[PDB]
Each structure stands twice: as C-alpha cells, then as structure tokens.
Design a protein around this ligand. Structure first.
Ligand SMILES: Cc1cccc(C)c1OCC(=O)N[C@@H](Cc1ccccc1)[C@H](O)C(=O)N1CSC(C)(C)[C@H]1C(=O)N[C@H]1c2ccccc2C[C@H]1O
Ligand SMILES: Cc1cccc(C)c1OCC(=O)N[C@@H](Cc1ccccc1)[C@H](O)C(=O)N1CSC(C)(C)[C@H]1C(=O)N[C@H]1c2ccccc2C[C@H]1O
Lengths: 326, 326
C-alpha cells in the first residue's frame, strides 16, 4: 500500500506526527505544515530554556551526517529562532533519503504553544520557492531518488474528531474518501493555494486566493468580509478573547460556498460550529476568524479538511478534494 | 487633593495608564504593575519589529538626561528583552523626580500581548528588593524628595466594569470606598504579599502566601487546590483553551474566603463569574485559574480588586482593603 504517519491532535489542530533523523533513527514530534518548506529540529547545542524538554539531534551519533553549516536566523515579533543546516537521513515509515534540515541552536518566544505541547519542530511540506535555502521539497526528493512513484501526498482527518488522522505519501488511498476526486490548479507554486469564488451570506468575494493549511484549527476570512458576514447574522461578540458565540440550532447562519469552475465546496453550520456546553447545550462557538494575511486571502484549516479529504500533487501542480469517509 | 492617573482597560486587565519622561515630557502608555519593580521604556535605538509602532524615548532631546548605561538582559521562555539604564525626570501628574529606568534596545517575543495592544512598557510599583539594580521604588523616591507626604498609593477599580479606574499617590482618597479600611502585614517586602487562610469549598489552605497583582485579570490558585475545588462543584472543562464553564445562577458554587486574624475578605460567585452570552444568558465563565507559582501561592487580580479598593503603604509595610464605592 502507501506509507502512513498517524496524525496526533494537540491544541485542536490535527497534524502532529513522528519522523526520524539519522542512521540511528532519532525520533521527533513534528508539526507537518503544508504552508511552509523547511524541516526544523532542536540541536544538541541548543542552550535555550525552551529546548530543555524536547528531543535533540546529535550529529556526532549518526554515521550518515554531512556537514553543511549555512547559518539561519528567522525572526518575527512572535519569536526568534537561529541555527544551522545539516544533511542527514530523514525517515517516514519505509521512506528514507538524505535531506537538508535546520538544526536549531537558539529559540526564544513562540509561547506558550511551543514549550507546553510536546512538538519538537516543524516539518514543512510546501513548495521549493517558499523554502530557506531553495531546497527541493522532501516528497519531491523522495521521487528523484526512485523511492516513490509519484510526488504526491494526502491528508485525511476524521469527520468524527476524537479519532487519529493520516498523512499518506506516494499514492492515493481509496479507503479515505467517497465519490469522485476533484482537482484544482494552484495559482502559485508557493503554499498550496487555489483560486476560488467564495460566497458566505449575500457577502461574497470573487477570485479569492484560498490557502490550505493543516496548522490552522479554524476558517480564515478577510476582516472586511468577516464583519459583513457577522453583521445581521445574529452572531455575538462578548469576550475576554474573541470567539464568537451563537445558538447551535441557529437557522439563520448560511452555508459556506467555495466555487471553482467545476465543483462547489460547502461547509454547513454543523461543521463550522463547536459545542461549548456539556450541560445544555444549545450554545456554540463559531470557528471562523477575521484575519488579514494578504489582499483577498482565505485560509481553509481543520474544519474544512475534516469534511474534505485533500490530495497534494507536486507533479501536476494541483490540489485534490473529496468527501471524507468513516 | 491627591495625584491621579486614569486606568485604561486593555485585555480585560484594568491598569494601563500614562506617565511622562524627560524635561520635554514625552508621553508613554504603561502597565502599572504592583508585582514588579523597574520602569521599562522603548529606546529610540530599538531596532526590533515590535518597537516599531510604540513610543520611544530620545535621551538626546531631554535636557535633564543623565548617562548611566548599566546593561540589562532579562530573559524568559516567553521573550527576551535587553537595554540600558538612564536617569531622567519621571512624571505622573504634578509629581516629578529624577528616576533610573531601562531604555529598551532590543525586544523579542511576548506575543501577541505586546505588539497588538498599545502599551509601550511597564511601570513597576513593587519593593526595592525585587528590582534590577536595587533601586528605591518611584513613590519612595518621591517621598525622599519631599514631593509627597507619605509613600503610599491606592488602586481603585470600578465595581461596574465599563468605567475608568484610578491610581492615586501620596494619600488615601475617602470617595473611593465604604466602611473601615483594614490593614494587613506584608509577609515579605518583595511583591505586595500577605499571609491569609483561604477557604473555597470545604477545600482550604492555611497560611497561604497571597499576592496582589493588577496585571492579572483573574484569580489564581495552586493546581492541587483548584482540582479539589472543581471536582464535585459542577464546573465543566470543555475547551480549545481552558475556561471553565458553569451556570450563572448556580447555587452550588461557594463563596471565596480570605481570612486574616481580623477580617475575612469574600468573593461571591457574582464577582468571579463572567457572562458568555448576550442572547440567553444562563451561561458563565469561571474567572479562577490553576497556576503554580510558588509553594502555597495565590494571586488576587482584577475580580478581587473590583470589590475591594486597595491601599499600598510603603511606610508601614502594609496593604489596606475597603469595599469599593460607586
Ligand atoms: C514554533 C516553531 C518551532 C520550530 C520552528 C519554527 C519555524 C517555529 O515557528 C516559528 C514561526 O515563525 N512560525 C510562523 C509559521 C512559519 C513557520 C516556518 C516558516 C515560515 C513560517 C508563524 O509565526 C506562526 O507561528 N504561525 C503562522 S500561522 C499559525 C497561527 C498557525 C502559527 C503557528 O505556527 N502555529 C499556531 C499553533 C499551532 C498549534 C497549536 C497552537 C498554535 C498557536 C500558533 O502559534
Ligand atoms: C510585556 C513587557 C513589555 C515591556 C517590558 C516588559 C518587562 C514586559 O514584560 C514581560 C515580562 O517579563 N513579564 C513578566 C513580569 C515581569 C516584568 C518585569 C520584570 C520582571 C518580571 C511575567 O513573566 C509576565 O509576562 N506575566 C506575569 S503573569 C502574566 C501572565 C499576567 C504575565 C503578563 O505580564 N501579562 C499577560 C497579559 C496581560 C494582558 C494581556 C495579555 C497578557 C498575556 C500575558 O503575557
């Protein structure tokens, strides 16, 4: 069949899994991130309080380590992180190829996400042009090395939450989905991003840049677009910190439509609302958030990926969509 | 009368206010923090993305600047921040005295709190032994310079939320409170901290170290203590991110008792629960959080300070409590 990796759930984002580095197979907990293109791991030299309880990579204990040592210093407001490049075996299931990754020397910030969960680093699965160092993506490298037949991968997330998810490499596994598998052309080879027309209420946006992101637990929508949606949709702002809140059985809330020239992709209130209560419960949390990334940009996260099984095809520069089984 | 400063509300913590540095009176938004003992401000040399939209301090533009230049580098997992000491005029209302503060050269992390709100830095109002540099507290310096009669200050927070609060320096303003003003001995001259016996349900902790902290929007309780409290109190854990949730009219939840050898300080469910709904609302958010600071340590934040007007007396090493008016 095809190679798997169980996706474990953490802060309501379902895309953490295990991969292994080195000839001695050091394990690491990773965020598999379709919206970035490098793999990051804590080095043994990392003297940051944050690295202290994570897994480290020791180049001196793997026979297949190749020195690189190009420095890197990624810095946002959120935190700073710096280290060096190394080449070694990177392994998922039966799949192994020398890959260049970043040994993290110093990491500050990204709290509390980082130190509190048990993720060690992130494993990007985006496009070459989005990487530091301009490095062919792992799956693409797997293909070049005649280890898999197609540079393709899929993410399955269970319609019924509680369960585990799967990242599959090198083929489409028929068991995960129902009906036909629709493809859409990428508008850029950066992130996995596609042109769609998006209608919410009577509020709509044509030729929107919509991005598939596993690291997101939520549905993203431009600020202007979100305000129109909520205004006269009987959704209520309240909080200490955002939300927002509505009735679970609210027959006012619309279906979310993402239309391509072939197929329309829909999200029912049932799939973008979250139960707040255990005693009750008529009361629900709206999984749609106002976020401005880039002129006209929507993010599809877990809520969407939990309905739709998604196929990421490096060979054809397309994204596949199907209704998820189980 | 006595010198004021309006407390502005930000992320449901009500203790942001304005003070001025230099002879040219450069304004800054400050977190007035009773649990720390330095004043921090963004320098003009700060090249961090985070400083970009804050107010800066320019020593070259104030006639009363005195060079110091002792370096500082405070570093947690949360973020890193580094700068140098300067002496200049620090002004709140009619009150002005040369004070040593920290010009921040570099600041990474503390996201998203910092860059998203409009606070520039923090103005500590704790005890000497808690500072970097071992520097007499601002109000204590104000006294030494014969600018105020007692090194004392008070924090008033409106019972009814929406309104503004006040930090008052050098006297007790009778209008803010009702009834008698009770004093408690500090157990240490570090933070404003006091020995009390704390009873929640039948769950209780004797000779607890309880800390007054304005920067906290919440009531803090040791983990073991919190678990006992919630177990069989019909409070429910649910979330993406904590909470917890209960009925607003829940006649099970106990009164919170903080007893000293003279006076018992109480918190009713009404004062430690927060409405989640606007349509409805029977449904409430519990403002008490499990946090382990130090063996037997409780934090009293806004929910408590909104009932009790609090006096901070440097001269007598005491904390005053009274039922807040208005
Ligand atoms: C943390 C880290 C460790 C090792 C190595 C790297 C590169 C790391 O990333 C630092 C960084 O610059 N991350 C970028 C994303 C990025 C990574 C790599 C290259 C380019 C960009 C961004 O600032 C960021 O944190 N984002 C962007 S969107 C997002 C809200 C999903 C979030 C995220 O990653 N995670 C979210 C999440 C996921 C699960 C649970 C909770 C949360 C909260 C939130 O933080
Ligand atoms: C932020 C900053 C800017 C400039 C300069 C300085 C010194 C700054 O302080 C960073 C720091 O080391 N803060 C220390 C306190 C401190 C300050 C100075 C010297 C020594 C210790 C502490 O660990 C801390 O962040 N705490 C203690 S408990 C807490 C969770 C309330 C939190 C806090 O402050 N704020 C919370 C809050 C409040 C409102 C809204 C959101 C949030 C999230 C959370 O961060």
């Amino acid at each position: 069949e095809f190679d798997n990796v169980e996706l474990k759930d953490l802060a309501n984002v379902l895309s953490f899994g295990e991969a292994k580095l080195g000839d001695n197979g050091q394990k690491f907990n990773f965020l598999f991130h379709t919206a970035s293109s490098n793999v990051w791991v804590p080095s043994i030299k990392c003297t940051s309080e944050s690295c202290e309880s994570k897994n480290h990579y020791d180049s001196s204990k793997s026979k297949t380590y190749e020195k690189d040592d190009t420095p890197v210093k990624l810095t946002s407001k959120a935190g700073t992180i710096s280290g060096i490049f190394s080449k070694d075996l990177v392994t998922i299931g039966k799949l192994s190829v020398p890959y260049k990754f970043i040994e993290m020397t110093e990491i500050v910030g990204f709290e509390p996400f980082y130190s509190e969960s048990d993720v060690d680093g992130v494993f990007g699965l985006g496009w070459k042009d989005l990487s530091i160092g301009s490095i062919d993506p792992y799956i693409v490298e797997l293909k070049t090395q005649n280890k898999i037949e197609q540079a393709v991968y899929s993410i399955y997330l269970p319609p019924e939450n509680k369960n585990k998810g799967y990242l599959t490499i090198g083929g489409i596994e028929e068991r995960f989905f129902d009906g036909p598998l629709n493809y859409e052309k990428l508008n850029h080879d950066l992130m996995w991003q596609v042109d769609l027309d998006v209608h919410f209420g009577n509020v709509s946006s044509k030729k929107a840049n919509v991005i598939l992101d596993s690291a997101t637990s939520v549905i993203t929508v431009p600020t202007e677009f979100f305000n129109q949606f909520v205004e006269s949709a009987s959704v209520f702002k309240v909080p200490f910190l955002s939300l927002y809140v509505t009735t679970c059985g609210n027959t006012k809330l619309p279906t979310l439509e993402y239309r391509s020239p072939n197929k329309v992709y829909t999200l029912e209130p049932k799939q973008y609302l979250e139960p707040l209560e255990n005693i009750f419960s008529a009361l629900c949390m709206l999984n749609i958030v106002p976020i401005d990334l880039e002129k006209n940009t929507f993010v599809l996260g877990d809520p969407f990926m939990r309905k739709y099984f998604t196929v990421y095809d490096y060979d054809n520069h397309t994204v596949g969509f199907a209704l998820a089984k189980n």
